[PDB]
């Protein structure tokens, strides 16, 4: 029971710890969204960050 | 000599198309400047990763 105590305490802790990772309202962590594209070049090229949900 | 008169009223409406023209210039300046600032505007809204406030 302690150990499975220790275990349902760390499992918490994960998710605590991976809901909170947000920048600006925008997450590659939390699995909200599929990816985040940024401005690469002057012409409206984009940058592709794949979400990598942990 | 009634030829040379008649170039003097001439010069009067060139000075005159010289002034339109001015300003003209003067303001097709100040509209290229600000189609610069709106094409950057407009770069910047592209952005796919941009709150519903910064839109």
Do not use: H, P
Not at chain 1, 4 to 27: H, P, Y
Not at chain 2, 8 to 29: E, H, M, P, Y
Not at chain 2, 38 to 47: F, G, P
């Amino acid at each position: 029971n302690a150990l499975k105590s220790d275990f349902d305490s760390l499992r918490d802790q994960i998710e605590k710890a991976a809901t909170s990772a947000k920048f600006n309202g925008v997450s590659i962590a939390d699995g909200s969204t599929t990816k985040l594209t940024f401005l690469a070049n002057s012409d409206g090229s984009g940058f592709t960050v794949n979400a990598k949900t942990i | 000599s009634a030829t040379a008169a008649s170039m003097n009223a001439v010069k009067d409406s060139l000075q005159r198309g010289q002034s339109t023209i001015d300003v003209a210039l003067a303001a097709g300046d100040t509209i290229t400047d600000l189609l610069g600032k709106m094409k950057e505007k407009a770069l910047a809204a592209s952005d796919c990763s941009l709150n519903t406030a910064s839109f």
